[PDB]
Amino acid sequence: VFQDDPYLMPASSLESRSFLLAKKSGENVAKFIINSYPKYFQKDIAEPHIPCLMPEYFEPQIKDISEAALKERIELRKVKASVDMFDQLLQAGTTVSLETTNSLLDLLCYYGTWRAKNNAERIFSLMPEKNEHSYCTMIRGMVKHRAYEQALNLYTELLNNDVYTFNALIEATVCEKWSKILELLRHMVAQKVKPNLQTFNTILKCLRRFHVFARSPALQVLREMKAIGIEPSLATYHHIIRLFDPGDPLKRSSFIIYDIMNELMGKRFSPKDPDDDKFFQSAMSICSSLRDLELAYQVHGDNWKFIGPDQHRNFYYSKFFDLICLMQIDVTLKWYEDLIPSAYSQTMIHLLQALDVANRLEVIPKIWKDSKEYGHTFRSDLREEILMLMARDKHPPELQVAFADCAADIKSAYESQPIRQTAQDWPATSLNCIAILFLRGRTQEAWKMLGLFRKHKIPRSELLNELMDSAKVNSPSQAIEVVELASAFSLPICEGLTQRVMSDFAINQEQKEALSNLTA
Amino acid sequence: NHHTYAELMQTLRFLGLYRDEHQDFMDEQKRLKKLRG
Amino acid sequence: NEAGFDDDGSEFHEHIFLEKHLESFPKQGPIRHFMELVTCGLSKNPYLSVKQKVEHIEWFRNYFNEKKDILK
Amino acid sequence: SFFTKLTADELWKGALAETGAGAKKGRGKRTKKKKRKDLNRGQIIGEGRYGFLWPGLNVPLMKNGAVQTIAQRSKEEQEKVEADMIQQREEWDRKKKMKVKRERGWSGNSWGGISLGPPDPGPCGETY
Amino acid sequence: EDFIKKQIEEFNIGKRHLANMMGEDPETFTQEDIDRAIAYLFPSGLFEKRARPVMKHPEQIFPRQRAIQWGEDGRPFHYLFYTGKQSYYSLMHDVYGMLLNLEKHQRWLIKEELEEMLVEKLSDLDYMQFIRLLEKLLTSQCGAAEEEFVQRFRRSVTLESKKQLIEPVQYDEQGMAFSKSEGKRKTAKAEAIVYKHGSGRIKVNGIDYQLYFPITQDREQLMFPFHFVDRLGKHDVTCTVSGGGRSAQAGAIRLAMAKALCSFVTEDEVEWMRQAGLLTTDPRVRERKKPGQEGARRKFTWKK
Amino acid sequence: RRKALPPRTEKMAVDQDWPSVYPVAAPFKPSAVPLPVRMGYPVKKGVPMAKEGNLELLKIPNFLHLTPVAIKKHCEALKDFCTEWPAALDSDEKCEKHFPIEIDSTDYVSSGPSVRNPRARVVVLRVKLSSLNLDDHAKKKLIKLVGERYCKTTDVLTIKTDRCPLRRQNYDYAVYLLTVLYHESWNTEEWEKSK
Amino acid sequence: KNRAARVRVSKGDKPVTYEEAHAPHYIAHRKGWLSLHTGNLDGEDHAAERTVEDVFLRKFMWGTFPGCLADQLVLKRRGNQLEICAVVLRQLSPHKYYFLVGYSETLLSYFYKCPVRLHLQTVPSKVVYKYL
Amino acid sequence: VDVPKDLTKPVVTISDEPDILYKRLSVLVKGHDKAVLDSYEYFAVLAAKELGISIKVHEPPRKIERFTLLQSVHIYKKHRVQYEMRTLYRCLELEHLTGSTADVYLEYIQRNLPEGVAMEVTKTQLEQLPEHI
Amino acid sequence: HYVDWRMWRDVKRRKMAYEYADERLRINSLRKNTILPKILQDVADEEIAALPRDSCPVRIRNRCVMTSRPRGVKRRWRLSRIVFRHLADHGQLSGIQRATW
RNA sequence: GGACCUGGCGGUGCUUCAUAUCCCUCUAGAGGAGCCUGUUCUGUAAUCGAUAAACCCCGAUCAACCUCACCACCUCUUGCUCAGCCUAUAUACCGCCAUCUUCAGCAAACCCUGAUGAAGGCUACAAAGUAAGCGCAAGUACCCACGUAAAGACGUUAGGUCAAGGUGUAGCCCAUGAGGUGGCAAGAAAUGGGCUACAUUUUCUACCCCAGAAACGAUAGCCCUUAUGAAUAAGGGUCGAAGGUGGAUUUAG
Numbered sequence A: 001v002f003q004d005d006p007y008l009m010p011a012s013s014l015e016s017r018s019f020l021l022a023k024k025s026g027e028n029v030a031k032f033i034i035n036s037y038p039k040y041f042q043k044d045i046a047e048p049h050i051p052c053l054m055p056e057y058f059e060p061q062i063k064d065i066s067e068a069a070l071k072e073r074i075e076l077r078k079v080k081a082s083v084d085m086f087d088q089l090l091q092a093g094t095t096v097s098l099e100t101t102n103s104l105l106d107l108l109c110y111y112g113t114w115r116a117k118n119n120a121e122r123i124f125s126l127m128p129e130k131n132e133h134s135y136c137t138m139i140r141g142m143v144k145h146r147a148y149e150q151a152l153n154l155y156t157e158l159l160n161n162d163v164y165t166f167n168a169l170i171e172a173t174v175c176e177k178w179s180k181i182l183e184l185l186r187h188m189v190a191q192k193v194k195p196n197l198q199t200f201n202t203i204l205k206c207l208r209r210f211h212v213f214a215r216s217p218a219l220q221v222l223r224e225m226k227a228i229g230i231e232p233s234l235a236t237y238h239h240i241i242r243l244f245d246p247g248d249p250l251k252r253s254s255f256i257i258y259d260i261m262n263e264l265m266g267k268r269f270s271p272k273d274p275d276d277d278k279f280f281q282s283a284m285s286i287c288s289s290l291r292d293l294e295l296a297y298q299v300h301g302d303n304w305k306f307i308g309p310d311q312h313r314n315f316y317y318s319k320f321f322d323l324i325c326l327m328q329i330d331v332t333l334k335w336y337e338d339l340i341p342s343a344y345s346q347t348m349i350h351l352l353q354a355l356d357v358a359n360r361l362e363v364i365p366k367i368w369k370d371s372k373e374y375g376h377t378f379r380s381d382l383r384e385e386i387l388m389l390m391a392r393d394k395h396p397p398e399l400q401v402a403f404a405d406c407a408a409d410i411k412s413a414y415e416s417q418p419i420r421q422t423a424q425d426w427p428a429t430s431l432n433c434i435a436i437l438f439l440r441g442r443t444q445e446a447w448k449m450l451g452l453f454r455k456h457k458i459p460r461s462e463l464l465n466e467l468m469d470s471a472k473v474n475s476p477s478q479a480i481e482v483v484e485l486a487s488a489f490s491l492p493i494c495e496g497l498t499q500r501v502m503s504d505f506a507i508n509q510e511q512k513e514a515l516s517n518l519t520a
Numbered sequence B: 001n002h003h004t005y006a007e008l009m010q011t012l013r014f015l016g017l018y019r020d021e022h023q024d025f026m027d028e029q030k031r032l033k034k035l036r037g
Numbered sequence C: 001n002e003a004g005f006d007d008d009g010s011e012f013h014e015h016i017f018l019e020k021h022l023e024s025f026p027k028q029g030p031i032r033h034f035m036e037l038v039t040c041g042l043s044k045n046p047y048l049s050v051k052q053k054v055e056h057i058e059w060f061r062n063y064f065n066e067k068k069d070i071l072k
Numbered sequence D: 001s002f003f004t005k006l007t008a009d010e011l012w013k014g015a016l017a018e019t020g021a022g023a024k025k026g027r028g029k030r031t032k033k034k035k036r037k038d039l040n041r042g043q044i045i046g047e048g049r050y051g052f053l054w055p056g057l058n059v060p061l062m063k064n065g066a067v068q069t070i071a072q073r074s075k076e077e078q079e080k081v082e083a084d085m086i087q088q089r090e091e092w093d094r095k096k097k098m099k100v101k102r103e104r105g106w107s108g109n110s111w112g113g114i115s116l117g118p119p120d121p122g123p124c125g126e127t128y
Numbered sequence E: 001e002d003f004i005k006k007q008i009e010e011f012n013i014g015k016r017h018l019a020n021m022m023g024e025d026p027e028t029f030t031q032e033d034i035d036r037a038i039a040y041l042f043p044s045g046l047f048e049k050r051a052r053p054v055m056k057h058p059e060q061i062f063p064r065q066r067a068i069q070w071g072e073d074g075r076p077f078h079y080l081f082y083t084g085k086q087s088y089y090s091l092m093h094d095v096y097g098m099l100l101n102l103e104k105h106q107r108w109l110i111k112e113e114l115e116e117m118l119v120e121k122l123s124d125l126d127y128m129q130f131i132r133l134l135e136k137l138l139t140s141q142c143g144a145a146e147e148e149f150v151q152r153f154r155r156s157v158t159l160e161s162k163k164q165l166i167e168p169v170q171y172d173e174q175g176m177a178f179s180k181s182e183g184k185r186k187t188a189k190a191e192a193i194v195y196k197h198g199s200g201r202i203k204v205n206g207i208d209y210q211l212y213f214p215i216t217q218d219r220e221q222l223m224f225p226f227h228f229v230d231r232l233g234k235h236d237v238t239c240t241v242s243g244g245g246r247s248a249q250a251g252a253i254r255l256a257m258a259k260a261l262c263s264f265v266t267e268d269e270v271e272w273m274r275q276a277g278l279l280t281t282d283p284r285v286r287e288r289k290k291p292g293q294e295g296a297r298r299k300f301t302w303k304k
Numbered sequence F: 001r002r003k004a005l006p007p008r009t010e011k012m013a014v015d016q017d018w019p020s021v022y023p024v025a026a027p028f029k030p031s032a033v034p035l036p037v038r039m040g041y042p043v044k045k046g047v048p049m050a051k052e053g054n055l056e057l058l059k060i061p062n063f064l065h066l067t068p069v070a071i072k073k074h075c076e077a078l079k080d081f082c083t084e085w086p087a088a089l090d091s092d093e094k095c096e097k098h099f100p101i102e103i104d105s106t107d108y109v110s111s112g113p114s115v116r117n118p119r120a121r122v123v124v125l126r127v128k129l130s131s132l133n134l135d136d137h138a139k140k141k142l143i144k145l146v147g148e149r150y151c152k153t154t155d156v157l158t159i160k161t162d163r164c165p166l167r168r169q170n171y172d173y174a175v176y177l178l179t180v181l182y183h184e185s186w187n188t189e190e191w192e193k194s195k
Numbered sequence G: 001k002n003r004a005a006r007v008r009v010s011k012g013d014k015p016v017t018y019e020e021a022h023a024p025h026y027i028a029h030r031k032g033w034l035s036l037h038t039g040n041l042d043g044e045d046h047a048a049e050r051t052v053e054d055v056f057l058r059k060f061m062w063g064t065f066p067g068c069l070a071d072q073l074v075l076k077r078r079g080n081q082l083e084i085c086a087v088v089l090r091q092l093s094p095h096k097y098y099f100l101v102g103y104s105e106t107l108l109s110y111f112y113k114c115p116v117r118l119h120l121q122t123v124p125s126k127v128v129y130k131y132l
Numbered sequence H: 001v002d003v004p005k006d007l008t009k010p011v012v013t014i015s016d017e018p019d020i021l022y023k024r025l026s027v028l029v030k031g032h033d034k035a036v037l038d039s040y041e042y043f044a045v046l047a048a049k050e051l052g053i054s055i056k057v058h059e060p061p062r063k064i065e066r067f068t069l070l071q072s073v074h075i076y077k078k079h080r081v082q083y084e085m086r087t088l089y090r091c092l093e094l095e096h097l098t099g100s101t102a103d104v105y106l107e108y109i110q111r112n113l114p115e116g117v118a119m120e121v122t123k124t125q126l127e128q129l130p131e132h133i
Numbered sequence I: 001h002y003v004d005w006r007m008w009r010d011v012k013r014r015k016m017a018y019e020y021a022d023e024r025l026r027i028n029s030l031r032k033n034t035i036l037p038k039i040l041q042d043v044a045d046e047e048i049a050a051l052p053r054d055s056c057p058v059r060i061r062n063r064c065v066m067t068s069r070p071r072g073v074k075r076r077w078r079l080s081r082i083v084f085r086h087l088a089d090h091g092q093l094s095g096i097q098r099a100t101w
Numbered sequence J: 001g002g003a004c005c006u007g008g009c010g011g012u013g014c015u016u017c018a019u020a021u022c023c024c025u026c027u028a029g030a031g032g033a034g035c036c037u038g039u040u041c042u043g044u045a046a047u048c049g050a051u052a053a054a055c056c057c058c059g060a061u062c063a064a065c066c067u068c069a070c071c072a073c074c075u076c077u078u079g080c081u082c083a084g085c086c087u088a089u090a091u092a093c094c095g096c097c098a099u100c101u102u103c104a105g106c107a108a109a110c111c112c113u114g115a116u117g118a119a120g121g122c123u124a125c126a127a128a129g130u131a132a133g134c135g136c137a138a139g140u141a142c143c144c145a146c147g148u149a150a151a152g153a154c155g156u157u158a159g160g161u162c163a164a165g166g167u168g169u170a171g172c173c174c175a176u177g178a179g180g181u182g183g184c185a186a187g188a189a190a191u192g193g194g195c196u197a198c199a200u201u202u203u204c205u206a207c208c209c210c211a212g213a214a215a216c217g218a219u220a221g222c223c224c225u226u227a228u229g230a231a232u233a234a235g236g237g238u239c240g241a242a243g244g245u246g247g248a249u250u251u252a253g
């Protein structure tokens, strides 16, 4: 969906989101222009007539109560229905058809809040003829758009006089209630409805949180589901996996569910429940807590559509790469360097600590360069982390050139942004390792950089060590005009200068030695 | 039909997306003509 | 080149054989001559279908039945 | 018609009449010159009569971490925008046509007491 | 200058990628394979090779330019730098030194190729005088190093065959020896099979010439090959023809008969026929008619 | 302000699945393509322009996709789908014996949104009367009826059908015409007997 | 003296592209065609319609991506599929670029009842063939 | 490393009726570029080889259509300018080819056409005699 | 928004001849037929004469689409010679070169 | 007014040349008669433009009705046009071409000479010129490497074209815009380009080349048929002349 050139190449999750949202907004603008000026695109130049390409017609026809009623279910709104009820009740006083009244009630309950109150209190004027369909759709509406006492009253009225109707009724009853839940389940199973288990899914959704006294009975309820043999175990299974949430991991149940989802993966899947999108995200959320790599590989035909939203995809990939990092890591970095362009701070931090524990120093540069190429700019948390981890090292002598290069790039990025004020406190935190790496070939750069640092300070023990190594690595005056100044500045450089002045520094001139004596 | 074409392009200029250079030119010269009489 | 536009399941004989649509005149007159030539040309024409051909012959029926004055 | 319409530079050439009969021979004209003007650079892409609110190009796409929606710029709003654009075009035209004051030397319309400033730097580097 | 090495290494990497995508090992690989791959993966209707897509090695793409002729500071390296034509003049100096050394002891190379062998322009006059110096060198005896210096510049003569192709004899049923040839013309194309053992009658498209050509100059042209060689009634021939013009088909059949008989007859008589000039396709064709002209060459009447 | 990341040249390795990175027809995309292939007439001691600005590679048709490896892969994939020709039918005499009635149609395809074009309707068919007529009177009658639809040098009777716009209309009309023609050549007339 | 799709030789102050530089009689010898369709070939038809619609498309896209392009376009019509290729500059934001891409795509598709798609290649500054 | 486990394949059903037998499929490509035509020919012949079917090749002649236009605008009859379109043909015959093979191959080739080319199929199928005859 | 009033008239004539095409064809056949009565031929001729103006397909002209130039237009491309030369030189359309034969 | 620089010009000198161009030369033609089609001119209510070279079967690879832009008559006034105008200005222009060009030079940027003036810069056994780039050229197209096409810059002719189209300026904006009926588009005449023949190498007949007869010439006119169209073209009968190979000059190869 994204373009190929590098400039248009979306190099971050938020900007990519905004980009394809702008594309969708252009699609909506196209819809608006076509449905505002249909006559322009009315020409059917293409030989195969396609209603997908034909302009769209939400235009009410002339006043015609019967055809207007038939067009009600075509226009998909509520003002037309109000006007039609008005025309049929006030002056006509007749019903075009009970099916038409049922469809009107369907639409009005779907559309639903004082407006919902008015829409629900304006349906009782409907002609006496109100069958089950009408009553149970009123229940549907009062449940999924308003409070639950009204739905309960309507259900009692119906009893005095469907699968997802009773589903909504159970939702209303539930949303501690032990006897309620029990009698509900009992009479529901007693009736001959034979639900599609969406009632069970909804009662699970309501049981999202409870102790073992309903977490464990869910297992036998699922075993009964399996015995009747209806459920694919797509959503209720995942919801009980989530309900397992937790002061202590349950390794036994974890292994059991591992085998279960293993055979579920082995078999082929077909979608039936609209809530299979939270499946992916919360499943990987539980996987992250579990921390297992064979588990991650198991969780990894066209079942990749259930990821959907970029937020859930982000959570999944983040937890996946985090587990893979915190698991050698050669195969992990292989998988990563394979999926980085397709895939999208915390992940990079985990990568840095994984590379540290691995000791693969040569890899971190390329990773930092990739992050910078994509979106890593105007933030120094990861810069601090990489600098500390890379200059805790000095063991590669030839790699000091790469140290200097990446340090120069890091400083080029660090000094970009004055107006923001955020670049002022970055050197105070991470300039020490940067300057040490610069010292480790080129030295004048690090010299003047430490000058700028101290002339911005927060001295440090490794800063003292840096100053000492720099001074000892031939030029007395060039070393003095730095070490003596930093000593006059602060006391630890002075207690180090006490020793520095022995070799060849104090013999040059006494005015700076006099200043040192005064400060000491 | 130039009808459809020109009507589409005029409406889209009024929307303000197609910077019609010839139309800009004509408009500026009409403005100058009505300014100078 | 014909995915769609199947001509309403029309048939070659419905196109070509117009004797079923020729009923209201004998088989000797000049009206017969003209209508036979019409059916010939229509069968030769693939561009138009049985509907168009019956519309043609119906307009011809209307024409000469409104000009039945002569019959010479 | 739109098919008859075409690019801008052609129109500018045809209007300026830079060459072909009058520019040559030095005959020129009676000190009348049409000044080149760039119109596409001036206005933003979103400007038009119907002032729909465009999160894509005319409005920032995101606000308060919330996606935006197409909206309407009503009568007095688009009138304010048109007045602002008129004022901006008038300002640009004023800045375009102005006086030019080269210091009077020996006499007006004479290059006697005029100074070109110091020479240019040399190729190898020589500042004068 | 580093751009050169950049392009070289990038071209090597692209060559490896090309071998991978085409699907052969990159160990063995050639530039004819390069050009075939480029022609297949990116065809082009462009007629000029310089315009067509070409994946070439950078050493051959970029024309060699002289590097810095003087050090970072101070003097230059070559000892003619303060004048132009330094290489040319140093070479001429060495040449004159060799000339005077040989004196005290006692094909050609094109101007553009010379300029591209060097990196300096020059003039026709100094080119001529250099050629004159070479000729003066070669007028006298010269040693092995001198001959090598001369042949460094001298090129191959590249002489053409100047020979008439001999078609192979053929054998069919009856043990019939024969030879087939083909001729063409303005708009006529024919093929004739000559049978040596047979002789006498001749057929044309299955019809004898006596009645196929009512005119006699066509038969005279058909006889001209045999008459020149003098073998008249000792060879028979058949021939098929497809053409518009009578004289056109006549000349085509003549050329085909000659191209078939040159095989049987000895090389001496083949040379004699070539000298006669009847063994070359007629390049003359009706010129194109022009839009402004009444014909191929004629202008409209000058109206003044 | 913003800068465009460097191309995928340095990123792509020597070992790479080109059929995967170029599945379908697509333009050159030099940023993704690593090859330095240039094309364009050079200036005197010049060179063709670099691939980044070389829009002539885009002008020309594109064949970076569908490499030989990709072709081999897709053929190996579709081998299980494609079927086999009968081994018994391995010669023209044998196939025309098994199924004498030859029939052939045709149609063009051109770039554009529309697809209909009247030449789709035309069809032709052929049959040799050497083995199908099985009689002499009806054969003479048929060859007298048909004017130019035959050819005795090759000995095949050929007939075309274009009277109907639909291909199947043409087909079944030709079939019915041949049937009625045979049935009417079977019989005879008194004026036909008198010759 | 012929003046037809060619540049007047200036002092050396005129950056010219490959196409704008080369002559029209060099079109088949050292250039390609901006469009690629079969209406021109023998037996086909609707060539006038192809040319009119592609000219209108070029104008509309030039004016709905104004100031960003620096060269003529490349049209590639494979059967039903329509492919566009453009070279542009990094003047405006990728937000605007993608928004206008989707906008033009939807408009062209709904107008021509044809599957349309386009590609755009970024350049920092327009490539120049010579300075005439 | 990301290599799929089980490649999902489309469903295929062998209808009880017999498949049609194409005697000869003669395809004709009309193009503007001989190089593009040669590339397309190599593509098609390699596909047919790897599928295991017969093939022959030959290059029909080049056809041209040219026409003269007025070079100038108002008054110039002798000064004209010419133009010409060159169409190049390439024909390919496939023999003894099953109906399903024909369908799959033509679908593949038609999806893998280039742009500036037109493609003309002549299908030749045999059949036995009808039942009324 | 046609280019000009003569283009407007041309398009009007085109649409009139179209919407009276089949009628004119039928009555013209009834006129030009020979064996039918001459009085009927005269009837149909008077009918054609009474038919409205701008309905015959001969009054239309194959004018240009871009510049509205009637003369110097190709029936195939429908474009004037000048605009065709312009597009061919600029390389807008596909598969035309200069005839350097 | 004296003296100079550049260019043009010389019925200006010397030399080398003239490819079909100067001639001498070779061939076939134009100014003879008729016809077709343009131009000038006459009259009409009845377009317009180029109208020497470098237009005259030119805008036009089309005008019986639209094409129609002329004219008489009759109507519309926001008029398909967020109007329109074939109204003037090609001496505002773009766009597109003729011209020398069947040439080969044009030249940013530097230096030098002339007392540092306009201006010039060539001597090869070489004396101040160096040259980006364009063009020529090369390569490309057709059958080759030749040939033919293509290409052929800077600039002159204020060259042609606001009538391919657009546009600057000036005007009509009940009109100088728009719409529908009709005719206009002939020749007392002069001129131009092409076709026909004025002969016997001709004319007719079957074939296109071994034959037999005569001793020609209408693509004009009258009548008729047919082609499409709602309403000029091809064919047939008759008429069977002018015409006898061109009055200076001139074209093309």
Ligand SMILES: [Mg+2]
Pocket: D108, D109
């Ligand atoms: Mg003054």
Ligand SMILES: [Mg+2]
Pocket: G001, G002, H079
């Ligand atoms: Mg010319």
Ligand SMILES: [Mg+2]
Pocket: J063, J067, J068
């Ligand atoms: Mg007219």
Ligand SMILES: [Mg+2]
Pocket: J085
């Ligand atoms: Mg007017």
Ligand SMILES: [Mg+2]
Pocket: D021, J090
């Ligand atoms: Mg002028």
Ligand SMILES: [Mg+2]
Pocket: J137
């Ligand atoms: Mg040349």
Ligand SMILES: [Mg+2]
Pocket: none
């Ligand atoms: Mg030429």
Ligand SMILES: [Mg+2]
Pocket: J159
């Ligand atoms: Mg003039």
Ligand SMILES: [Mg+2]
Pocket: J228, J229
């Ligand atoms: Mg007529």
